[PDB]
Write a protein that binds this DNA or RNA. Structure first.
Ligand SMILES: [Mg+2]
Ligand SMILES: [Mg+2]
Ligand SMILES: [Mg+2]
Ligand SMILES: [Mg+2]
Ligand SMILES: [Mg+2]
Ligand SMILES: [Mg+2]
Ligand SMILES: [Mg+2]
Ligand SMILES: [Mg+2]
Ligand SMILES: [Mg+2]
Ligand SMILES: [Mg+2]
Ligand SMILES: [Mg+2]
Ligand SMILES: [Mg+2]
Ligand SMILES: [Mg+2]
Length: 51
RNA sequence: CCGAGGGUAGGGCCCGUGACUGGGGCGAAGUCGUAACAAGGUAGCUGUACCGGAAGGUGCGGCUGGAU
């Protein structure tokens, strides 16, 4: 497998720490309920990589 | 003399436009309370007046399109 050289495009803020905010939308307290469901999911993902 | 029209001045109407402002219509979700529909938890509605974040409240009279 000839690994295609992916070392051509550079990136400034690619390794920097990131702010993440989740906001509820359409559907009243149901979307608010899901914004926690998205946040735990990103919490499981952050701790799974020692973040 | 009249006279197209030009000029000066002052009015009337209509249209476009204007910092800003007043409310109105619409919204798969927001905040605050819950005024009305049951006696809707203070029966409701009403003209008027005063008042209150807001639905609204209270006064004076009126109607029943008011339960028991
Ligand atoms: Mg003459
Ligand atoms: Mg003339
Ligand atoms: Mg003339
Ligand atoms: Mg406006
Ligand atoms: Mg009332
Ligand atoms: Mg009520
Ligand atoms: Mg009532
Ligand atoms: Mg009154
Ligand atoms: Mg006031
Ligand atoms: Mg106040
Ligand atoms: Mg009062
Ligand atoms: Mg009365
Ligand atoms: Mg009468």
């Amino acid at each position: 497998q000839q690994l295609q050289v992916l070392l051509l495009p550079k990136d400034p803020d690619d390794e920097r720490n990131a702010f993440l905010e989740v906001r509820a939308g359409t559907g009243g307290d149901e979307a608010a309920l899901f914004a926690g469901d998205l946040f735990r999911m990103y919490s499981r993902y952050a701790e799974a990589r020692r973040w």
